[PDB]
Amino acid sequence: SPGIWQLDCTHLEGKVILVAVHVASGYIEAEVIPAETGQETAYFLLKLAGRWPVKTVHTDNGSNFTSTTVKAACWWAGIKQEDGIPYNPQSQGVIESMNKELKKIIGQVRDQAEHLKTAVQMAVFIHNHKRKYSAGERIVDIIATDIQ
């Protein structure tokens, strides 16, 4: 459970927002990309796995699940690539709600930033710091407990 992440892709301003969610904590990392290619997804996963102990990734769609470049990146980084089917059907709505929530935060800051990418990183910040414990606190606690 501490090593499980879910990929998520949502759209805004004709652009693509790629999100990785640490399932047990709700902690996220995100980036803006021109389009969701294998190359972009691969690079995003490499960055993620260099920063957090990523054991398993539930991919966001069949194209990324099939992508040879994504498979290569997962091999390189020691990531088990899995499908992202909501076997628990509440897993659709939880992601839908996060996307809605992210876009809402982006709207609240959009005017502060000239570029969408800045607004997205402001949203990551606000999300991970928000007291609900914060997601940042939860991921650290979960991984630390696993270590020791």
* Residues at the contact surface with a second copy, assessed by CB under 8 A: 29, 43, 46-47, 49-53, 76-77, 117-118, 121-122, 124-125, 128-129, 136-137, 140-141, 143-145, 147-148
Q: Verify binding: residue 94, ligand C5Q, rule CB under 6 A.
A: no
Applying the rule CB under 6 A, the residues between 106 and 125 that interact with ligand C5Q are: 112-113, 118
Q: CA 99, CA 17: separation in Å to the nearest integer?
A: 10
Q: CA 31, CA 121: separation in Å to the nearest integer?
A: 8
Count of chain residues binding ligand C5Q (CB under 6 A): 25
Q: Verify binding: residue 42, ligand C5Q, rule CB under 6 A.
A: yes
CB 127 within 8 A of CB 106: no
CB of 32 to ligand C5Q, least distance (A): 13
What count of residues does the chain have? 148
Q: How far is CA 16 from the centre of its chain?
A: 13
Q: CA 80, CA 57: separation in Å to the nearest integer?
A: 6
CB of 137 to a second copy, least distance (A): 6
- Nearer to ligand C5Q among residue 88 and residue 132 (C-beta): 132
